[PDB]
Design an enzyme around this catalytic site. Structure first.
Site, PDB file in Angstrom:
ATOM      1  N   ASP A 193       0.927  -1.254   0.101  1.00  0.00           N
ATOM      2  CA  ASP A 193      -0.150  -0.009   0.124  1.00  0.00           C
ATOM      3  C   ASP A 193       0.924   1.180   0.022  1.00  0.00           C
ATOM      4  OD1 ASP A 193      -1.959   1.637   0.025  1.00  0.00           O
ATOM      5  OD2 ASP A 193      -2.992   0.990   1.906  1.00  0.00           O
TER       6      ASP A 193
HETATM    7  N1  LIG Z   1     -10.705   0.981   0.815  1.00  0.00           N
HETATM    8  C1  LIG Z   1      -9.590   0.955   2.039  1.00  0.00           C
HETATM    9  C2  LIG Z   1      -8.599   1.646   1.202  1.00  0.00           C
HETATM   10  O1  LIG Z   1      -8.931   3.118   0.883  1.00  0.00           O
HETATM   11  C3  LIG Z   1      -7.760   3.772   0.122  1.00  0.00           C
HETATM   12  O2  LIG Z   1      -7.260   2.924  -1.078  1.00  0.00           O
HETATM   13  C4  LIG Z   1      -8.305   3.463  -2.250  1.00  0.00           C
HETATM   14  C5  LIG Z   1      -7.595   4.744  -3.076  1.00  0.00           C
HETATM   15  O3  LIG Z   1      -7.538   5.735  -2.091  1.00  0.00           O
HETATM   16  C6  LIG Z   1      -8.580   4.986  -4.122  1.00  0.00           C
HETATM   17  O4  LIG Z   1      -7.914   6.038  -4.896  1.00  0.00           O
HETATM   18  C7  LIG Z   1      -8.509   7.474  -4.163  1.00  0.00           C
HETATM   19  O5  LIG Z   1      -7.571   8.026  -3.441  1.00  0.00           O
HETATM   20  C8  LIG Z   1      -6.146   8.491  -3.910  1.00  0.00           C
HETATM   21  C9  LIG Z   1      -5.007   8.671  -2.606  1.00  0.00           C
HETATM   22  O6  LIG Z   1      -4.824   7.525  -1.639  1.00  0.00           O
HETATM   23  C10 LIG Z   1      -6.010   9.175  -5.251  1.00  0.00           C
HETATM   24  O7  LIG Z   1      -4.816   9.414  -5.596  1.00  0.00           O
HETATM   25  C11 LIG Z   1      -7.075   8.516  -6.226  1.00  0.00           C
HETATM   26  N2  LIG Z   1      -7.015   9.458  -7.322  1.00  0.00           N
HETATM   27  C12 LIG Z   1      -8.600   8.369  -5.501  1.00  0.00           C
HETATM   28  O8  LIG Z   1      -9.364   8.010  -6.577  1.00  0.00           O
HETATM   29  C13 LIG Z   1      -8.276   3.890  -5.045  1.00  0.00           C
HETATM   30  N3  LIG Z   1      -9.419   4.058  -6.030  1.00  0.00           N
HETATM   31  C14 LIG Z   1      -8.941   2.707  -4.241  1.00  0.00           C
HETATM   32  C15 LIG Z   1      -8.053   2.388  -3.101  1.00  0.00           C
HETATM   33  N4  LIG Z   1      -8.707   1.126  -2.420  1.00  0.00           N
HETATM   34  C16 LIG Z   1      -6.711   3.924   1.006  1.00  0.00           C
HETATM   35  O9  LIG Z   1      -5.493   4.453   0.442  1.00  0.00           O
HETATM   36  C17 LIG Z   1      -6.270   2.382   1.703  1.00  0.00           C
HETATM   37  O10 LIG Z   1      -4.903   2.442   2.516  1.00  0.00           O
HETATM   38  C18 LIG Z   1      -7.256   1.726   2.292  1.00  0.00           C
HETATM   39  O11 LIG Z   1      -6.975   0.473   2.634  1.00  0.00           O
END
Ligand SMILES: NC[C@H]1O[C@H](O[C@H]2[C@H](O)[C@@H](O[C@H]3O[C@H](CO)[C@@H](O)[C@H](N)[C@H]3O)[C@H](N)C[C@@H]2N)[C@H](O)[C@@H](O)[C@@H]1O
Ligand SMILES: CC(C)(C)n1[nH+]c(-c2ccc(Cl)cc2)c2c(N)ncnc21
Ligand SMILES: [Cl-]
Ligand code: NA
Length: 266
Positions: A193
């Site tokens: 991650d």
């Molecule tokens: N569900 C739990 C998870 O939630 C986030 O993960 C998600 C990302 O955030 C998403 O992306 C969005 O946020 C990003 C920055 O993090 C941006 O750059 C991006 N353009 C945005 O669309 C991506 N689509 C899916 C991913 N599962 C956390 O990071 C992760 O640790 C945690 O376990």
């Protein structure tokens, strides 16, 4: 052969470790664990306490063993105490002082280029750990099966997809992702991650990484994709610079798209 013995005892219970700290409840976290910050205790370091119940307990347990293993090689939080009961897991770690890469990028916009170079160099260090050291499998086969179950169990956050998949049904992401397969095997030790939230800067230096629950052997693009995506909120030049500093000439867009799609499920 067994001999009858007396009554022994343990030396340390979680209660004494927590004396004299101020308590705060932060946001959920990687797999939904409750996160507590412990602070404001004289002559004692800031701590974090993670509590997982039920399925989330397994995630906290997974993070505990990876912290334990990986800290031999990389700067990570130190485990102070961990408890596992049938439906619960508690993980107490020492905080890495400082701010996230995300925070510092926002506070020092002019420092983006130095920040990305540091991130790239740190990632190379991680990826250089010979896989013979690593007892954890996090490969695409394993992650795809995890993704399938999360989809089937109704756990995917469809409201949190990347812009290019905004409004897609989970099943459509699942199907479309499978068209990018197969691709060439690559195996390095990965974080799992590698977002801007999970790298910690202090006094202008990248000094550690956190949230290591998905650590294991996988394709290097597992980490490059997630960071690249994060840098996409800021600038395409920082995105590009990540691959350049890391040393890749032609970012594999297939592998990039695959790992971004795969992370939609988590
Ligand atoms: N569900 C739990 C998870 O939630 C986030 O993960 C998600 C990302 O955030 C998403 O992306 C969005 O946020 C990003 C920055 O993090 C941006 O750059 C991006 N353009 C945005 O669309 C991506 N689509 C899916 C991913 N599962 C956390 O990071 C992760 O640790 C945690 O376990
Ligand atoms: C979630 C967990 C327990 C892995 N976690 N979270 C943070 C953290 C630090 C700064 C901010 Cl601004 C937000 C979170 C953190 C840390 N520094 N050190 C160790 N674990 C940390
Ligand atoms: Cl929980
Ligand atoms: Na360490």
């Amino acid at each position: 052969r067994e001999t009858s013995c007396s009554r022994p005892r343990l030396n340390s219970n979680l209660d004494a470790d927590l004396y004299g700290y101020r308590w705060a409840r932060d946001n959920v976290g990687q797999s939904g664990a409750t996160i507590y910050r412990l602070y404001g205790k004289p002559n004692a370091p800031e701590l974090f306490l993670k509590h997982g119940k039920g399925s989330v307990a397994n995630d906290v347990t997974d993070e505990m063993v990876r912290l334990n293993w990986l800290t031999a090689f990389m700067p990570l939080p130190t485990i102070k105490h961990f408890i596992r009961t049938p439906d619960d897991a508690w993980l107490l770690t020492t905080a890495i002082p400082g701010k996230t890469a995300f925070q510092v990028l926002e506070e020092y916009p002019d420092s983006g280029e130095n920040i990305v170079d540091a991130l790239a160099v740190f990632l190379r260090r991680l990826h250089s750990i010979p896989v013979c050291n690593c007892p954890f499998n996090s490969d695409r086969v394993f992650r795809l099966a995890q993704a399938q179950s999360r989809m089937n169990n109704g756990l995917v956050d469809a409201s949190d997809f990347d812009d290019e998949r905004n409004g897609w049904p989970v099943e459509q992401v699942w199907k479309e992702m499978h068209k990018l397969l197969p691709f060439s095997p690559d195996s390095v030790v990965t974080h799992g991650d590698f977002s801007l939230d999970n790298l910690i800067f202090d006094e202008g230096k990248l000094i550690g990484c956190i949230d290591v629950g998905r650590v294991g052997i996988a394709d290097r693009y597992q980490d490059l994709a997630i960071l690249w995506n994060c840098l996409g909120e800021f600038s395409p030049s920082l995105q590009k610079r990540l691959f350049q500093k890391y040393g890749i000439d032609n970012p594999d867009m297939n592998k990039l798209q695959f790992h971004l799609m795969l992370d939609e499920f988590f």
